[PDB]
Amino acid sequence: NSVQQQLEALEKSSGGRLGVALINTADNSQILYRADERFAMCSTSKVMAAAAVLKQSESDKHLLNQRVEIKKSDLVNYNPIAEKHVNGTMTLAELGAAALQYSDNTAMNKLIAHLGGPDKVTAFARSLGDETFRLDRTQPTLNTAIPGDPRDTTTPLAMAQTLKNLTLGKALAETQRAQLVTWLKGNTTGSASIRAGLPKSWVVGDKTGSGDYGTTNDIAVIWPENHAPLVLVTYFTQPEQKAENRNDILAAAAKIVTHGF
């Protein structure tokens, strides 16, 4: 029972398509399963929009405190933080935090509107060397996750490399890097995903995403107690539009690939 065989068996019994990329930053060794295939990102794409705004703040000291007005008209489907500020204002930093830690969709759309559109998020990704990421739509329609649709997709390997560069590497200056890591560590939505497959004392920063076709994603940076960090991307999708989301498959996959660390 090698890792590969265990993942193939998990995928087969699950009835879907699983994509995994683990980077072990101690020796840059990788564990890959369908890591070259495109998957709908769903709300894991919120990390790239928040990071694009942090990049702007490197050269503009006042940006993150800029205020944005929240009107009743700005609310889409899932806005647990923005609805508490209707008629009020939120700073760009508070929108970043809400988008990542609660997956607030109004917060994401405001960040995209500030940047000038989804093509500007793609151009940010390209500036990091990510040739794979593409963002095409806003919330909530970037969650349609139609099989074979290239829109709003990336690959597990590209996203694992980019998330390493963002949280641990060259992509952001130190204060901005640290702020992104703080937001990911504060996530409230990932208890039953990757985190549930790991030892309870490891420190995890993650961003979930779910959508149609039972599409269930999580991307994480993992800090073991006595080892270098690991970056893990788990994507999962299924062939029926109304399939149930399967966070338990992500937890299982994370348990398989971290057996040994």
Quote the strand ranges of the chain, DSSP E. 17-24, 29-33, 39-40, 67-69, 89-91, 153-154, 203-210, 216-223, 230-237
- Active site members: 43
Amino acid at 135: L
- For residues 1 and 171, give the distance between their C-alpha atoms in angstroms, rounded to a whole number: 38
SS3 call for 246: coil
Rounded-to-integer distance, Cα 43 and Cα 87, Å: 25
- Residue 134: what are its φ and ψ, rounded to 5°? -145, 130
Question: How many residues would you count in the chain?
Answer: 261
Q: Cα angle at 37 between 36 and 38, to 5 degrees?
A: 125
Parallel, antiparallel or unpaired: strands 230-237 and 203-210: unpaired
H or E segment to which residue 56 belongs = helix 46-57
